[PDB]
Point group: D2
Amino acid sequence: SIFTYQEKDIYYEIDGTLDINSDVIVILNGIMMSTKSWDAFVENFSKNHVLLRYDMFDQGQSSKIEESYTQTIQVELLKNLLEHLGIAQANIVGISYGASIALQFAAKYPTMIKRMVVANVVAKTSPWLKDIGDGWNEVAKTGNGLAYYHITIPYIYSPQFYTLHNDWMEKRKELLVPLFSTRTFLDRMIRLTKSAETHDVIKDLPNIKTPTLIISSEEDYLTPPFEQKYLQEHLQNAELVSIPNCGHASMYEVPKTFTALVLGFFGQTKLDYQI
Amino acid sequence: QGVSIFTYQEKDIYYEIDGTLDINSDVIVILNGIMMSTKSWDAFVENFSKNHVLLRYDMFDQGQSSKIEESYTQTIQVELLKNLLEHLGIAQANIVGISYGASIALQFAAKYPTMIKRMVVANVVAKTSPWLKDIGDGWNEVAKTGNGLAYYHITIPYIYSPQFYTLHNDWMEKRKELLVPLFSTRTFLDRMIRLTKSAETHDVIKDLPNIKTPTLIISSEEDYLTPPFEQKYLQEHLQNAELVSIPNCGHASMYEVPKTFTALVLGFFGQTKLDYQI
Amino acid sequence: SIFTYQEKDIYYEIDGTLDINSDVIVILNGIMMSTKSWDAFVENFSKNHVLLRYDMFDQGQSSKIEESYTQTIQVELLKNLLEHLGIAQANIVGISYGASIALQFAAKYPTMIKRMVVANVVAKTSPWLKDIGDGWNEVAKTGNGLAYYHITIPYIYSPQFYTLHNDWMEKRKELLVPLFSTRTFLDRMIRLTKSAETHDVIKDLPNIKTPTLIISSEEDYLTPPFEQKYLQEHLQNAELVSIPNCGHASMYEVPKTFTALVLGFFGQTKLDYQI
Amino acid sequence: YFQGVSIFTYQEKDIYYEIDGTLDINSDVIVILNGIMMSTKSWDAFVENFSKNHVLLRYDMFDQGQSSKIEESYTQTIQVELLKNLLEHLGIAQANIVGISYGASIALQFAAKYPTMIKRMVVANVVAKTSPWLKDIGDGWNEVAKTGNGLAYYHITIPYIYSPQFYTLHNDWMEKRKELLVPLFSTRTFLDRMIRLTKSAETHDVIKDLPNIKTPTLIISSEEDYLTPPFEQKYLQEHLQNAELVSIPNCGHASMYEVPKTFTALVLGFFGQTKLDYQI
């Protein structure tokens, strides 16, 4: 499926029959993710929901953006995509980069969101995180896929996970390094990383009344828990959940947990409790 | 005496079923805490029983079930659960327990693992430490005096987190002026003493490497009764266990974070397949 | 010897030779403590320092105050005791109840403190903490030392410590219970607990420039770490230290660490680092 | 010559060392084991406080500071034997040892082989073994260092040395560090030293020796340490039996730099203690 949005082609996948009948779950990908990266979650996510997966600009099978852009064009992408598919409201679950989009999207179009689940998410790109991005880009500008791997992924996963499932890491390392060596992937990553520099929804938080459940990884070395602790206080109806011994990629480290929180929060009939 | 009443060993067991129960039903059974009854889960009935058949019951010395004046461990609560499930024609069930109920869930999963599909344990220990045991001796000792005011003050501020206790203090005070009378009646105190003493023998450490039951452990960071290091121990010795920590939350995760508790329970039971191909 | 103060006798102990050129370390006792409860620390504490230990009102071998009193009585006791001994300025270290006294003292007489080390300390008695104190008092009124034991002591130590050294607990238990059963000990505890109800130095915290090192126990179920976190943020020159797997009684669980923190902070020649 | 003052001729190579105070057989000595990016001058701020009641011994290990280079593949073994022979050179029988990061690894190995030459020990931001995780991070540093890019090398190392809070709070201070560090990180000789020091840490493994280390140890752990995480310190503390653990909230891998008062208090306090045995 292709959403001819603006001048470019936007790739999206739909699991389940989309008619106005059912609740939609929209997945907002991380900066290194595509639609196929959520294949393991499709069956569980689309049993009582219509699952909407799509690749953002400069992602996966979607077209490129060779000009300077912030995360704004990704937010407008999400709105126009939903309007294209005739989706009035939807449950939004985003992670990392996608989690940043969801917060911006909840700040501009709250009437298109039922409930929201953000994982491994900051309210604003700190000077610390920005310099990390400059590190990723500078290494990507050399075209060294081996170097680019060894500086990104050990901080995506917790040290415990990387060590425990090291053979799993190595087998994936043999193919990720060639992927990280291609100028196609890297140039897309550079652009996607620069766009995240201007991420700032701090002054939008006290006005986002969208029911939110925040997932926090204790061993997240990219978006540390203190950033999630901040988010939960300034969001009015925010829920917080911490995942012990887990890195920035909670999706893979604890898939049963991730799904439980997402399906559980979206699946609740009532959210107000009479206790 | 009997509808919503299960006569068992010439004694009455009160229970409630929400939804219609047949052979197709996917059941969620709730194992109560040491101070809880079926009515304490009223706020979760609508959500838990939307796509499930909610089975709530009161254990011995609990709620509106009969009393047990003879000394007893938690083994009679484990057999109770089996015979109750058999009585209602329930072969398998999803078990969610908390505190005392979570201890019954573990002992049950060790004895009758075939009667469980999935399990969620919240604020749970694998074994009653000498620390927790002496805390119980203090609860009992004050209960032995009949002082309801004293009993309240030495139990409840440990049920909840300091932050929640402070933030919702007037929710604690209006709920206190009726708790103190409850804590002042002997029968309730007598039930509390026998239930607390039944937990002294909680020990499933040897059973942990054998429990193949898919389990989600709920941990509270500000739990001053069943501390996080206990759940961490449980999640390491169980073969198929997952751990979740709730920041700024007391022993009563049921009441402090009802949204989270529901999401985790419904989410873990509602998953089609726990096998992820990563 | 004895310090006749304020109508009444105050018991104190001095280790070393007292000069005005003395490096004095004053220890502010916990609510259940006395001078005899710091004996194990005496040798280390009084090697390069002159150690002053004293029993506060309703404590140890000091007289009783049957009248209703707050912590401001203990505060004036410390000042007058120091003036009595001719001590102008001294390093003050306190824990629990004594640590609360230290804060009220540092806010009223900052010129009589060189450096301060407070352990297991809050800036204000929370409604939660006070209702705990009401529980202690309400049980203390029944005279049941057996009941009074099991509702106080297991919360003073961490579960790990109480379990690992249960023999150490049980042998002390056979002595603490007869002591907790005396009306003399209980009446003192009740009044010492009632005085701790009015603890509030929140307003004073930004005005305390006294160099402070805050000790916090992760498994403190009485004065939790978040209260220390609050303390370290609103004191301009305060450093924080967290002790893993430790309870409200730092001294007995980690005596090597406690003394290292106290001696190390006081022993430091210069606190300002060109770094 | 051997009239080289503050120079120890070892295996036909020059080892630089600095001593604050005067040395004696009676002298109470503190030996500092540097981090992987550190030298003797990296401890200047601590000199006055550390040498108050102790004889401070600072020295640069191989491929560090002012000491000679190594252009052979070496493990941390040559760093351990260096410490032993340096101590013997100065006539030091026993000494208190404080080590951080890389030097902390040397301390444990030294405590594993020569426990008689240690009085008391302090280790900060320390692992009991180089994990496959920590090892692949080092490969990342090495890979980037190979390119000679100083700007890239800086951005992939230092943000993980300091805590995110600290790095943001004292940010403009970090960027003026950067104007001087980027050229330093661009020099081949510096990068080559960093590579060989990194490769040497790959074979760090003292799990074998932990239950045999009876040395009075105080472990300093940082909560926002993203290179030697807290869980690694908890492991060390449970398999060492004369070990105590202290945690530093809101602090990164460079604990000494973020909390200099705290670091000093723990070191001076744990060493300056006369008798460790408490009758409680």
